């Protein structure tokens, strides 16, 4: 038996809401150390890596490594039947072709029990080259979402320029161009309002806005986001999942 | 002649919003004891029965029993035009076949006078007698609304199974299957957000989920809903209309 | 050079919201006396005329009259990017391309520099010249908005009847008919409905409700609206924008 009881159900709701548009199907690599997902998106452009560590779960049980192939659109639909404050328990027999999802209200008067059909899929594998990056921008998650959205009216691509004297997002198109300059803070007082740049050398990279606008569906999961960049390698957009792990999205620059 | 004055016109806005999707035209039986509507949907699976007592109105007079044929699409349109806190007055002179509806804004600035056909058409008048039911379930209306909404993502039918210690709703379909068990809870005193059962013998019936989703548009009219059920007879779904009367939806099971 | 600055970002946004569904490509006349926009809408039915005097901006400089051809949907989008508390700067250097729109958030965290390509359109004019009208009605803007919206459920045309009593809007279609009567009560009254009317002779004209429902998108720009009517000429619906300027709509009555 695999069995994982997650007390804050909102978290799994949000993860599915952040993945279902970008990718339709993917295998859930389950083990004693946690749950891990790794997939390309459905247009073969970006890469996604999800991690939810075992200890994040209130109760956790994994007799042996499972791989469950999963339609995320169906999984999301089922999770929309969960409340935000439900305790969600995930359960699969060792080689069973189903995943049960139990949504307990907090007072135990209402209990729901769903049994999802798996789909049978060939796993993907990479993980990408772990790297020391030139720039790391930490910033509010709501601010990053709004920027990508604003600039998507102007252009299909965004140039992210970092230097010592700031970060800048620029886009360009048929109706013109725009530049959004977001200043580092010093003493912001809260921690989650900070804009901090860890800079080694200036960098200027171009990314497809369409894909960044997918990545920002993870905003509910965290109040900050970090962007790690270096020349000619994929951007990582990282959202922390409430002490349990993370959702990274990798994207090639143009060129 | 007919005239009924209702100071809390918000109630009548809620009833028409409850009726307009399911039923398109209906007979309005007006008498000195009040308003009684009764109709099948255009597909013959369900029946609605509405009752508004004369004493529920601020003023009421009926000279003359009347069977006004009414287009509920058109009446819901006109009611849209009413303020939330307008006084609503319904009116019919005699050998005129028109229903007038007068909305007087809260601080007598503005009177709106509306009038609609009153197409007296070949119709019905059933009733169907008092039955004794195997189960009667009372529960919060918003909770029944939620279970019908969520299960409609899974299948197009719901098995309702009643038992001493609770009621279950189960559905099955494309993306897998689902059951929601609500427990009898007692409490009472501080609120009736309870789930109570009255069980002479257990019941187990399948119903059309889309119809139950029409019925739940009445959710805003009452904090609770009752479900009376028996083998082979139509389910009743009752909503109380704040000390003026009731709204009952009737649905026959399958097989 | 042209340059204008405003603290009231919001007003600009509301002007574009109120124009952009009626007209696509527009020509802004920028002179030293201010900004002027005059155009038919894209169906050649109604006429719009916007005026924003130079004094209404808290800085204003214009060396040379410019005719800046803009797509109003694209400019509404851009202005959607700005904080409602943002300081806005409009800037152009004289012709081809660049209108620059700069949004500076209140305390210096964020600056947004946009640049809109201008197309070459001729500066229109015609400026149909003023008149004394049989009848001039002034009323709450949100009440005028609500009357057009509601009657649009009954009919496609409204008949405005002005009289010493007050003003009456009446519409008629398939479902039946409706009239709304606002009366002149005296003075010193709490209700915000002091509908006032300056009158030479009762008028009675019909108007397409589709277009009136375009003109009420200006509702946020002012709390009152003034209607000016005579037989055989266009209605004028005027929103005064706070001694900054005005937005006028012209619609001819049905024959």
Numbering used by the authors:
A (entry chain C), B (entry chain A), C (entry chain B): 1 to 255
Relevant lines from the article:
Monoubiquitination of PCNA represents the key signal for the switch between high-fidelity and specialized DNA polymerases to bypass a variety of DNA lesions at stalled replication sites. As a first step towards understanding the Ub-PCNA/Pol η interaction, we used EM of single particles to determine the three-dimensional (3D) structure of the native Ub-PCNA in complex with full-length Pol η and DNA. A molecular model of the Ub-PCNA/Pol η/DNA ternary complex was constructed by rigid-body fitting of crystal structures into the EM map. The structure mapped the location of the C-terminal domain of Pol η, elucidated the mode of interaction of the DNA with the complex, and captured the conformation of the ubiquitin competent for binding to Pol η.
PCNA is a DNA sliding clamp with a pivotal role in replication. Not only does it regulate the activities of both replicative and TLS polymerases, it also acts as a scaffold to recruit various cellular proteins involved in DNA repair and cell cycle regulation. PCNA instead of Ub-PCNA was used initially for fitting, considering the multiple conformations of the conjugated ubiquitins on PCNA adopted in existing atomic structures. Cross-correlation coefficient was used to distinguish the current fit from the one obtained by 60° rotation of the crystal structure of PCNA along its pseudo six-fold axis. The reliability of the fit was further supported by the agreement between the identified positions of the ubiquitins from the map (described below) and their expected positions when covalently attached to PCNA in the current orientation through the Lys-164 linkage. Consistent with the presence of DNA in the complex, the central hole of PCNA is partially occluded by a conspicuous density, reminiscent of the DNA passing through the ring. Importantly, this density adheres asymmetrically to the inside of the PCNA ring when the map is rendered at a slightly higher density threshold, implying a non-uniform interaction of the DNA with the PCNA ring. Intriguingly, our model suggests that the DNA backbone interacts asymmetrically with the central hole of PCNA, only forming stable contact with one of the PCNA monomers. Furthermore, the DNA transverses the plane of the PCNA ring at an oblique angle of ~13°.
